[PDB]
Amino acid sequence: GSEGAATMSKVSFKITLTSDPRLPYKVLSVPESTPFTAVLKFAAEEFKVPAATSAIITNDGIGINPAQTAGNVFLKHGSELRIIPRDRVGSC
């Protein structure tokens, strides 16, 4: 984890693991300034999942581009998102 409570401008995310029949959730807290791309790795390790075949998407089956601050990603995309598995080639 990290140390930081109430800094100035943060953005929390609510992602649920759509892999288990329990659909567990976890509220994360990080500075928007940070890239939403990191939220993945975190949201991953958080669920003890590999940050290789995983990615966060919207509620429209559309991916996300961490080409901006999380606050700009979680805003443009939203907070309520789902973590889905990713695969470049193979998997089958």
Side-chain angles (χ1 to χ4, degrees):
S2 64
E3 275 208 80
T7 73
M8 248 159 118
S9 263
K10 273 191 169 185
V11 285
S12 67
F13 321 80
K14 197 191 275 116
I15 311 139
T16 287
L17 211 68
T18 65
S19 59
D20 227 48
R22 297 200 264 84
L23 258 99
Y25 84 90
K26 68 103 161 152
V27 190
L28 181 74
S29 66
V30 323
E32 47 183 55
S33 163
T34 281
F36 206 106
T37 209
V39 169
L40 191 259
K41 282 180 83 129
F42 204 129
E45 53 91 340
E46 258 291 88
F47 278 123
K48 280 98 151 157
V49 296
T53 58
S54 329
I56 297 139
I57 61 154
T58 59
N59 50 76
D60 234 302
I62 279 163
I64 304 176
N65 294 272
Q68 43 270 330
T69 63
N72 216 35
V73 172
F74 101 122
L75 189 98
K76 82 170 39 273
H77 298 275
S79 75
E80 289 160 293
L81 323 148
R82 281 133 225 290
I83 210 162
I84 71 95
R86 202 204 260 287
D87 157 49
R88 287 271 151 194
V89 48
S91 239
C92 267

